[PDB]
Curated annotation (Swiss-Prot):
Protein name: E3 ubiquitin-protein ligase SMURF2
Role: E3 ubiquitin-protein ligase which accepts ubiquitin from an E2 ubiquitin-conjugating enzyme in the form of a thioester and then directly transfers the ubiquitin to targeted substrates. Interacts with SMAD7 to trigger SMAD7-mediated transforming growth factor beta/TGF-beta receptor ubiquitin-dependent degradation, thereby down-regulating TGF-beta signaling. In addition, interaction with SMAD7 activates autocatalytic degradation, which is prevented by interaction with AIMP1.
Tissue expr: Widely expressed.
Residues of the full protein shown: 10 to 140 of 748
Domain C2, residue spans: 1-110
Domains: entry comment: The second and third WW domains are responsible for interaction with the PY-motif of R-SMAD (SMAD1, SMAD2 and SMAD3). The C2 domain is involved in autoinhibition of the catalytic activity by interacting with the HECT domain.
PTM text: Auto-ubiquitinated and ubiquitinated in the presence of RNF11 and UBE2D1. Ubiquitinated by the SCF(FBXL15) complex and TTC3, leading to its degradation by the proteasome. 'Lys-48'-linked polyubiquitination mediated by TRAF4 at Lys-110 leads to SMURF2 proteasomal degradation.
Organism listed in the record: Homo sapiens (Human)
Length: 131
């Protein structure tokens, strides 16, 4: 059957303040492409270096993958594409090698070029499978 993997979102670095003189409110939201399983970490009020020390227990089967995406609560409310921070994506092969590593630093950047490049952050996590 599937394998439960715990992706621990330790903290995030260089939180794009987005709007000058203003501050973002980072929070995490994971999605499972194949199970519809979603999870989320509390929001961090006006910060440039948040942390949640919280993990998500997703599942992986054969060729499954999981993506932990962070969003700026302030702009998610702003609407109109506003609200994105840094989406981190790990595949099945990456999930395994990492599941034992115990730590991974994924830079929080935009989905891609010409696609709202309002990023500049990073994020530290830890991959360990559940017994």
């Amino acid at each position: 059957g599937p394998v439960k993997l715990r992706l621990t979102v330790l903290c995030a670095k260089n939180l794009v303040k987005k709007d000058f003189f203003r501050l973002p409110d980072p929070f995490a939201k994971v999605v499972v492409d194949g199970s519809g399983q979603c999870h989320s970490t509390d929001t961090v009020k006006n910060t440039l270096d948040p942390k949640w020390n919280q993990h998500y227990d997703l599942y992986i089967g054969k060729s499954d993958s999981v993506t932990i995406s962070v969003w700026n609560h302030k702009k998610i409310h702003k609407k109109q594409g506003a609200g994105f921070l840094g989406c981190v994506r790990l595949l099945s092969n990456a999930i395994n090698r990492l599941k034992d590593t115990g730590y991974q630093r994924l830079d929080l950047c935009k989905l891609g070029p010409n696609d709202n490049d309002t990023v500049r952050g990073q994020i530290v996590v830890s991959l360990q499978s559940r017994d």
